[PDB]
Design a protein around this ligand. Structure first.
Ligand SMILES: Nc1ncnc2c1ncn2[C@@H]1O[C@H](COP(=O)(O)OP(=O)(O)O)[C@@H](O)[C@H]1O
Ligand SMILES: Nc1ncnc2c1ncn2[C@@H]1O[C@H](COP(=O)(O)OP(=O)(O)O)[C@@H](O)[C@H]1O
Ligand SMILES: CC(C)=CCOP(=O)(O)O
Ligand SMILES: CC(C)=CCOP(=O)(O)O
Lengths: 247, 247
């Protein structure tokens, strides 16, 4: 009875910010809160990618370690600024969004969460709060520092909290049989593991994490810039790309 | 071999005293990275108004829908002040990293009864400087509550057992009478019996200090004079000194 919604990076922003679509997402959620429990995870957007790439966080604690520590902290602060933008938008619509710093509760190894703290998340959901996490800088056991993607957060949360469904808000209507740039690109309504592996053999992080998530939850990939898509996915109606739970 | 420094809300705000934070950072730089440091700061003029307004200390009672929104608003203001302090520390070349207190702690009777400490340890190991703040917090009894900096410091003292805990205050230390009286005398060496004498006649800080002294040496110093922090870190004579309890 809990839904995890992953706000795409290109969805919420591009240091830009699309207030209108965040209001749309909040209004959509308000039609189901507080009857359903929601965890939100928002991407780095135009706030975290600048500093992460400028400081090359994914390289680890190598070379100029002092500059990399400073940039680690600056990138986290920028992500906190974006998180505040989103949280304020959600509060304005009457929804009690509450911020949870991903780097405070997660440890990384090989881009994957290998250590987590979920009790405060559980209690937040129990008191009918909407916890809002974000792709973040994170301490990595192998390379000191790394970038924890929102997809990995969602996969850890999926395998630990076993939500009812996981909804990915993307810039496209769902998963396509080819690159949507191409002219003949067709949208896959019902996704299966066969076409997922076929697509991977030729974004890929998203398909891999979705393969893992589908073990525990039903997955949706929808276009987050159209309001009714979120409600349709929450209500289980036909919308976007559906990846049913692997049985 | 690690020192916890608690920045009182009166020296960091009451508003933002950038110069005092800059002095604290310049003093800390004399020991980084040979000494491990954790920093906790209060609400000052950021979390105190919101917490007084939304009546967070009453818990989840009355109009709870407003209480949740105010809980979140207070946390966001705390994050804003935290960012001010963090950016100040970063400009001076110290890798201060923001740890969200409400993300890793759970309260009962205003005391931390649940806590996540592994990320703090990993931050200290990788020569980072964690910076926590007095915060809003989930309470197991009243739903929501205000987690003060003194309680954070007492919990971290129990768990991590720092070499010392240093309280930065508006005054030179613990006095005989109130410092507003002309004849007040500064107690340069505090013991259990002098503490107990003082309580029977701020008191929260003294109770927490009595608890902390079981694990660590405590210093009460004036945060407005730059050199006091370094005098306390090196163990020199400064302010009030509560030695670690023996038998
Ligand atoms: N078959 C496909 N179906 C859907 N999207 C695709 C496909 N092939 C390539 N893409 C592109 O990959 C992108 C995936 O975004 P992604 O990188 O997962 O977001 P984030 O940066 O938040 O992780 C989409 O914007 C889309 O343009
Ligand atoms: N016996 C005393 N010795 C020293 N200071 C005192 C005493 N009694 C009251 N005070 C004053 O009361 C004020 C309360 O400070 P407090 O708000 O507890 O610190 P913080 O800002 O860390 O919470 C202090 O600034 C201090 O000047
Ligand atoms: C700070 C940062 C780039 C986090 C990861 O972003 P995303 O969730 O992978 O879009
Ligand atoms: C959010 C809030 C009122 C924090 C209070 O912290 P502190 O007791 O001033 O250290």
């Amino acid at each position: 009875h809990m839904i995890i919604i992953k706000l795409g990076g290109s969805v919420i922003s591009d240091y830009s910010f699309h207030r209108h679509i965040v209001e749309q997402i909040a209004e959509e959620i308000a039609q189901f809160y507080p009857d359903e429990s929601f965890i939100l995870v928002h991407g780095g957007g135009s706030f975290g990618h600048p500093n992460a790439r400028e400081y090359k966080i994914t390289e680890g604690l190598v070379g100029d370690v002092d500059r990399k520590r400073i940039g680690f902290s600056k990138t986290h602060q920028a992500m906190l600024k974006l998180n505040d933008l989103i949280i304020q938008t959600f509060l304005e619509k009457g929804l009690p969004a509450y911020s949870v710093s991903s780097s405070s509760i997660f440890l990384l190894e090989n881009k994957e969460v290998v250590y987590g703290e979920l009790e405060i998340l559980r209690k937040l959901l129990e008191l009918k709060f909407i916890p809002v996490l974000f792709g973040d800088t994170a301490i990595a056991l192998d390379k000191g520092i790394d970038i924890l993607s929102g997809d990995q957060i969602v996969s850890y949360l999926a395998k630990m909290l076993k939500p009812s469904k996981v909804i990915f808000l993307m810039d496209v209507d769902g998963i396509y049989d080819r690159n949507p740039k191409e002219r003949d690109a067709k949208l896959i309504e019902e996704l299966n593991v066969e076409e997922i592996r076929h697509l991977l053999e030729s974004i890929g992080n998203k398909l891999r994490e979705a393969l893992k998530i589908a073990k525990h939850s039903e997955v949706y990939f929808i276009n987050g810039k159209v309001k009714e898509n979120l409600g349709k996915a929450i209500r289980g109606e036909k919308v976007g790309t559906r990846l049913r739970k692997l049985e």
